[PDB]
Design a protein around this nucleic acid. Structure first.
Ligand SMILES: N[C@@H](CC(=O)O)C(=O)O
Ligand SMILES: [Mg+2]
Ligand SMILES: [Mg+2]
Ligand SMILES: [Mg+2]
Ligand SMILES: [Mg+2]
Ligand SMILES: [Mg+2]
Ligand SMILES: [Mg+2]
Ligand SMILES: [Mg+2]
Ligand SMILES: [Mg+2]
Ligand SMILES: [Mg+2]
Ligand SMILES: [Mg+2]
Ligand SMILES: [Mg+2]
Ligand SMILES: [Mg+2]
Ligand SMILES: [Mg+2]
Ligand SMILES: [Mg+2]
Ligand SMILES: [Mg+2]
Ligand SMILES: [Mg+2]
Ligand SMILES: [Mg+2]
Ligand SMILES: [Mg+2]
Ligand SMILES: [Mg+2]
Ligand SMILES: [Mg+2]
Ligand SMILES: [Mg+2]
Ligand SMILES: [Mg+2]
Ligand SMILES: [Mg+2]
Ligand SMILES: [Mg+2]
Ligand SMILES: [Mg+2]
Ligand SMILES: [Mg+2]
Ligand SMILES: [Mg+2]
Ligand SMILES: [Mg+2]
Ligand SMILES: [Mg+2]
Ligand SMILES: [Mg+2]
Ligand SMILES: [Mg+2]
Ligand SMILES: [Mg+2]
Ligand SMILES: [Mg+2]
Ligand SMILES: [Mg+2]
Ligand SMILES: [Mg+2]
Ligand SMILES: [Mg+2]
Ligand SMILES: [Mg+2]
Ligand SMILES: [Mg+2]
Ligand SMILES: [Mg+2]
Ligand SMILES: [Mg+2]
Ligand SMILES: [Mg+2]
Ligand SMILES: [Mg+2]
Ligand SMILES: [Mg+2]
Ligand SMILES: [Mg+2]
Ligand SMILES: [Mg+2]
Ligand SMILES: [Mg+2]
Ligand SMILES: [Mg+2]
Ligand SMILES: [Mg+2]
Ligand SMILES: [Mg+2]
Ligand SMILES: [Mg+2]
Ligand SMILES: [Mg+2]
Ligand SMILES: [Zn+2]
Lengths: 103, 218, 58, 52, 159
RNA sequence: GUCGAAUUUGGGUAUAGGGGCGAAAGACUAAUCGAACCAUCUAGUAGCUGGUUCCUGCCGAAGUUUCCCUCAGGAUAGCAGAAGCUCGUAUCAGUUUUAUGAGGUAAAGCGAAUGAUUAGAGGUUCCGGGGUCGAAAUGACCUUGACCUAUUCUCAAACUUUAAAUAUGUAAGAAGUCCUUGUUACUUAAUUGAACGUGGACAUUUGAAUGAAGAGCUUUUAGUGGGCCAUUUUUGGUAAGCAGAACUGGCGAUGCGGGAUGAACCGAACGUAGAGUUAAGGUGCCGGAAUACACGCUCAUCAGACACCACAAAAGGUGUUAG
RNA sequence: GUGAUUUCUGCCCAGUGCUCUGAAUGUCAAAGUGAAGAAAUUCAACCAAGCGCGGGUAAACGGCGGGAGUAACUAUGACU
RNA sequence: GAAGACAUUGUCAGGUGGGGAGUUUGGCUGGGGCGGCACAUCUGUUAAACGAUAACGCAGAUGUCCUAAGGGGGGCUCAUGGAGAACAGAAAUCUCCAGUAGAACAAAAGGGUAAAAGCCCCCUUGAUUUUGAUUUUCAGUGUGAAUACAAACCAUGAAAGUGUGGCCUAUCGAUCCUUUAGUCCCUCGGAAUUUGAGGCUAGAGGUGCCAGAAAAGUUACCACAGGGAUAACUGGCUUGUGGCAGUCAAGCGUUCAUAGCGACAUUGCUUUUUGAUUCUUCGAUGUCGGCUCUUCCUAUCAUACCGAAGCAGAAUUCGGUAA
RNA sequence: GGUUGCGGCCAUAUCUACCAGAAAGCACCGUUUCCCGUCCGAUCAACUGUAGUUAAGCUGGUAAGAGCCUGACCGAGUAGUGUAGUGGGUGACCAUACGCGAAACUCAGGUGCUGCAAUCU
RNA sequence: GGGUCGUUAGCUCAGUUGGUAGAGCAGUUGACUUUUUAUCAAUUGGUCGCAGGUUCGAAUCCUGCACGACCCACCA
RNA sequence: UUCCUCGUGGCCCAAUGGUCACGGCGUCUGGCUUCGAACCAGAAGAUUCCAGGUUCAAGUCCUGGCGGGGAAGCCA
């Protein structure tokens, strides 16, 4: 799909409380950190004899992932996020559609 | 190789005609529906006889073909090729299905039985009702004795019981012999190559003037 | 080894053992789902009305 | 049950590979695309390509 | 596999009419609905928004809410061994006054008229309706109407 | 079979159970071996098979919905009992009538939309294939295919103008009707409306029929979750005492009289007795009851004799009867 | 592994193993090293064996193809 | 004598390690397996004119696509046919007339649409925030999808209005953990500050066996609990298939239908073939054939007695009473 | 009664071919500085009502007209269907009792009605 | 025994899924050359085994009636 | 019966939705040689086995038909 790099939308930043200009970028997961309770517990469980203790997913079935937008307000510098349907191809910088021209 | 006709004698299922959903059928064994001097005028063959049904069954296409052939053969050889007009009044539009079944010795190792037993088309048939006409013949009054038994000789090719009737009508028209005769006495009867048109009291008067001139020419 | 898939047999009898009695009716039915803009008015309408009757019969 | 045994050549390296699996295992099927480029003047060991 | 969508088996039920396609006549929007009106439901296939589910076609209920473009309706639905009341929201295009009531309250005001009038002289107004009574006696003359004798008709083929 | 040797054999000794031993059979290891014997964990676990002990009285079902690595099992809803509680002829009903809605089946239709399909007829070619007169012509004549116009025969579960029967929604008042003026932050140009009210007026003919064996409400829990048969509608299949659906009635869970015989058919459902009358079925005898009465048909060198039911067809006969 | 003697044991290392290379921008654990920070810690560089890359190996496991035209009767096809 | 701070030994870490240990190897299914997905869904039909309604029923479809193919406003009307204009002809561009949609609306199909929902143009991001109520599946749970409001901030149009994604019916996901946004809010329990960690609200990372285990095979060396809920013998219904017999008559037969044959059609019988289903038996009915022995059927090879022939005699063919 | 503006029901109102229309209204009709939009003042924009014409639009009438609407003991109590029988038939199917009841076809009649406001020999 | 079909000039064979027989080999004649084989040209030779539907009609369409090829055939 | 595969210049085959489409052998013209080969210069030829839908375009994308080839057929 194609999504513009800017968008004007409601910003609940306690100072805007109205439609404002928002910069948009694609959300990405972010590196998983150690010392989280989950990782610490999982490592504790794996230590010692017994082998693999937690289930490991294999039956992958879905090909795509839902895309999530990261909105940045130009005034209050607060971040809001919203999602879209599934899509195989995604893109911010978009050459707009042109009708009259040929193939 | 043909499954005996007793397996499809009665109307057990809804009509299953060729269409955009059927799309794969054989061809009807019958192709000819009008026999004899089919260009004869309406007034050439006054007498008309019908082969009517006394049953609610399905008549196979090749059964119709065989009766057609036998009747035409007899009429042409005996009464002459230009003494009668034959018209069959049914068409094979119902497709018959079959579940062709493995018939070898030891096929049970492969047959899979009744699972997924939707049939395949192999034949066409026509659905008839009690009182519905199958065959129709129009001739001269002098040829009735030949025709009536020609049909009687033909009835043996269809399954079930079928009567033979002498219609009180003129030719293939929907009018009685005298009432039609007087209507052609006046001018409102004007024939075509095989059938005839009639003047009506309705319509644009100028157009009604254009044809049937004698009816007004009193 | 197949088995009977579905049927509605005997279901009508099963129902009719205990009558299809209508649920009930009441005065002053619930205002759940009605126009809240109308509710907000009505609650003050009664608020004033009771005060009026109280002062009138005082 | 029917078990699949198949032989397949590597697209890029050219080496020959094979395996066998029961007819249910869903191994990943890659996505490819033939893209019809034009070749410009050849510089140093790089190439030089051309879209439409 | 099976298929039970929101509009399944509605091929003919939502076809509009013959020679009645196009826009809706304004009288529907000129209708006025009060709370407590009893009203039937007949879905209009040309207005996809605010349609009723196919089960409620041809049902009748009671208005309980009025909004800018829709009306809240109460419908009694039989499920299992009882009735449950269902609350709907329907645009006025699938809505038309049930004239059963419109006929009914004419009776109410008519009986009011007869009751007061007959109360003015006390002659037992007799308001209740009665079913079709068995017709009372009468006498029939033959003057200029001498009875005609009939007879069964024989069989003729008539083809 | 072999019988001077890879021969046979006594006694002592060594190898011990996931171990030994094997000129290899998964063979032998104390009648036990594709993992010896003894005791303990151990009364191991079992969605699986068998059994489950006295009497009487009252009520009395389900093989169906949804979810589950669920399909020989569970949870959940339903059907049933028990405990009752608030009241005293009602905010009722597997019913009819009046009024008023909705439906796309049965039927019907194709010289009405779509699709299929037999046949001729009349035109139209600046324009199909052609031929004849022709060098050709936007020239003439025939023929075959289209195209158009008026007709003709037959069709549709996934076609249709029209359109039933049976089933199906709502209303037939007191929580009602009419008059006056009070509240509101809602609404209106506006005390205009909307909703809720004060006060006043109208009762047993208070707004169709019939019945009501009391009406309404709450808790808790057993069993069940393999169904089958009959009429009618109907799917796959040539068909089946086949497989799969809809409504109702049964069997299961049910005895009694009849169908000789039978779970489903007909009649009719049950405390213990006496008397009277019948249902379906019968009245030559077995066998209770007229070898009753009356009008006709039939002689069979395989007659016939009662629904479900225990089968018969196409086609023939100066046998016989009536048309 | 094969199973007296005689006569022979043809071609294939692409695949699975085995073995031998290690001059190497391949990859890498613990330990150790460097930088940031106040510290937990984070990020880097380096890194043995192993794997990857490259040879040998069939009396190792094993394998050892199709389609057309063609000769003075026809047929077939030495040949292509 | 040799060897030497190297071996060896001890502890961690990477590699190798069916030699050995533990465990698994979905469900539906006209037995099981192979096949297919009817396993989550959508359109039409089966579906019997409210709703609901099964089968490994029929014809198809989904795990996408779209900053416009969303929203508002304005202007215009499509497919096709006829008639005309240089190259240009059957198809290039332009004009007129007819044109109820026969076109188009992302996709499968069905509804719906003509100053539009279709084509062109202009401006925008309502495809936004806060949780609620309701409809479908339904237990009246969840998920998905959808409807009508309220409180804000906006877009478009002059305005009434419209807009909470795609004209409507499908296009998708629980607990734990990780991660992101908001609040910068609460806690680290002897008292403080800063890192770090843990909490509240709202999303993403996926379970397609789609209410959601992490999972390869063989057994004829096999074992246990069971199942006639389920296959191979036998038995029962049916007769497609096999076998046997009729009815009509185009022809064969030097002429001539029926001396003897008999196509295209059509009516039947049998269960000695092979099929369909799974009703009885899986706490066992001994399952091919050959040998011997008894009885029964007739659809008659011969023998007995007859009729017919394209029966001169001989030989032969058809048929009848006959087991 | 005619006409105009806004409509309600939505063909008895549509379609084809001809004929007629006083007055007013409506209409065609003349022009391009301004606001405005197009390839083009053709549509749309603005000004005049002056220069003209009922030719057209529109309204009404005519047609053994197409269509559309209504009705009829025309077709037909036919097709179909609810309930019952130890009814008939080998069977396909069919009559009877108590009830409901079409479509096609034929014939006859009709060819817009109406609300509010304004104007008109 | 049942299905599946194909047989066309002396020989092989395209035949066109519904109108009239094609091609090659063969043989005869002619040109070439001292005559020939090779090469080229031109003829010759096919009612496509018996009956029906029949489109104007049928080798060609199929149906039954010939000969030669392909596969099928208890059971435990 | 199912499932799969294949059909393209005379022959064998290759094919990017974006050019009537590619190679090798073969064929034709000219050259060398007394001549034919080999050799040297150049060319040409295909309704992608029959009908529809999609696309702007389809050999290709797919659905419906024809011909050919391969696998399956086990516990009784
Ligand atoms: N008794 C098994 C065999 C069934 O059939
Ligand atoms: Mg530790
Ligand atoms: Mg460890
Ligand atoms: Mg069950
Ligand atoms: Mg099922
Ligand atoms: Mg309708
Ligand atoms: Mg010794
Ligand atoms: Mg062994
Ligand atoms: Mg032993
Ligand atoms: Mg115990
Ligand atoms: Mg689960
Ligand atoms: Mg059991
Ligand atoms: Mg329907
Ligand atoms: Mg019908
Ligand atoms: Mg009709
Ligand atoms: Mg049609
Ligand atoms: Mg009703
Ligand atoms: Mg219990
Ligand atoms: Mg329970
Ligand atoms: Mg339960
Ligand atoms: Mg059970
Ligand atoms: Mg039981
Ligand atoms: Mg009983
Ligand atoms: Mg006695
Ligand atoms: Mg008879
Ligand atoms: Mg007689
Ligand atoms: Mg040996
Ligand atoms: Mg390290
Ligand atoms: Mg290394
Ligand atoms: Mg193991
Ligand atoms: Mg299974
Ligand atoms: Mg329904
Ligand atoms: Mg618009
Ligand atoms: Mg829900
Ligand atoms: Mg809004
Ligand atoms: Mg749109
Ligand atoms: Mg929407
Ligand atoms: Mg999630
Ligand atoms: Mg967390
Ligand atoms: Mg599930
Ligand atoms: Mg195992
Ligand atoms: Mg075994
Ligand atoms: Mg059984
Ligand atoms: Mg069997
Ligand atoms: Mg049979
Ligand atoms: Mg047979
Ligand atoms: Mg059995
Ligand atoms: Mg057994
Ligand atoms: Mg036993
Ligand atoms: Mg025995
Ligand atoms: Mg005999
Ligand atoms: Mg050359
Ligand atoms: Zn902001």
């Amino acid at each position: 799909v194609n999504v513009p790099k800017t968008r004007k939308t409601y910003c609940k930043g306690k100072t805007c409380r109205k439609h404002t200009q928002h910069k948009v970028t694609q959300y990405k997961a972010g590196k998983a950190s150690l010392f989280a309770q989950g990782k610490r517990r999982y490592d504790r469980k794996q230590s010692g004899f017994g082998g693999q203790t937690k289930p490991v997913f294999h039956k992958k079935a879905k090909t795509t992932k839902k895309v999530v937008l990261r909105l940045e307000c130009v005034k209050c510098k607060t971040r809001a996020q919203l999602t879209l349907k599934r899509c195989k191809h995604f893109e911010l910088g978009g050459e707009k559609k042109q009708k009259g021209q040929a193939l | 190789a043909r499954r005996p006709a007793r397996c499809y004698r009665y109307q057990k299922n809804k009509p299953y005609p060729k269409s955009r959903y059927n799309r794969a059928v054989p061809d009807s064994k019958i192709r000819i529906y009008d026999l004899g001097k089919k260009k004869a005028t309406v007034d050439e063959f006054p007498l008309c006889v019908h082969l009517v049904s006394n049953e609610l069954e399905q008549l196979s296409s090749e059964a119709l073909e065989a009766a057609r052939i036998c009747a035409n053969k007899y009429m042409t050889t005996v009464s002459g090729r230009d003494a009668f007009h034959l018209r069959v009044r049914v068409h094979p539009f119902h497709v018959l299905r079959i579940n062709k079944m493995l018939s070898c010795a030891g096929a049970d190792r492969l047959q899979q039985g009744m699972r997924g037993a939707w049939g395949k088309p192999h034949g066409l048939a026509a659905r008839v009702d009690i009182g519905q006409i199958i065959f129709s013949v129009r001739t001269k009054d002098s040829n009735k004795d030949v025709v009536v038994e020609g049909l009687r000789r033909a009835r043996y090719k269809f399954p079930g019981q079928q009567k033979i009737i002498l219609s009180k009508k003129w030719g293939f028209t929907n009018l009685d012999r005298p009432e039609y005769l007087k209507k052609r006495e006046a001018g409102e009867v004007k024939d075509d190559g095989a059938f005839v048109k009639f003047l009506s009291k309705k319509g644009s008067l100028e157009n009604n003037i254009r044809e049937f001139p004698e009816y007004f020419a009193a | 080894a197949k088995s009977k898939n579905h049927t509605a047999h005997n279901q009508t009898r099963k129902a009719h053992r205990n009558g299809i009695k209508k649920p009930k009716t009441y005065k002053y039915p619930s205002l759940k789902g009605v126009d809240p803009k109308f509710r907000r008015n009505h609650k003050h309408a009664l608020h004033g009305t009771a005060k009026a009757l109280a002062a009138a019969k005082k | 049950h029917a078990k699949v045994h198949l032989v397949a050549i590597d697209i890029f390296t050219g080496k020959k590979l094979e395996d066998l699996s029961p007819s249910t295992h869903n191994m990943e099927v890659p996505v490819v695309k033939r893209n019809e480029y034009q070749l410009l003047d050849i510089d140093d060991g790089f190439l030089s390509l051309m879209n439409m | 596999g099976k298929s039970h969508g929101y509009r399944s088996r509605t091929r003919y039920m939502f076809q509009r009419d013959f020679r009645k396609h196009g826009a809706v006549h304004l009288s529907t929007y000129l209708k006025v609905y009060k709370v407590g009106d009893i009203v039937d439901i007949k879905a209009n296939g040309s207005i996809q928004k605010g349609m009723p589910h196919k089960f409620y076609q041809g049902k009748t209920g009671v208005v309980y809410n009025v909004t800018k473009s829709s009306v809240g309706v109460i419908i009694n639905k039989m499920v299992g061994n009882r009735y449950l009341e269902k609350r709907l929201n329907l645009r006025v295009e699938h809505i038309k006054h049930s004239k059963c009531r419109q006929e009914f309250l004419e009776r109410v005001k008519a009986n009011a008229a007869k009751r007061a009038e007959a109360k003015a002289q006390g002659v037992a107004v007799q308001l209740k309706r009665q079913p079709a009574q068995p017709r009372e006696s009468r006498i029939v003359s033959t003057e200029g109407n001498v009875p005609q004798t009939l007879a069964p008709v024989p069989y003729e083929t008539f083809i």
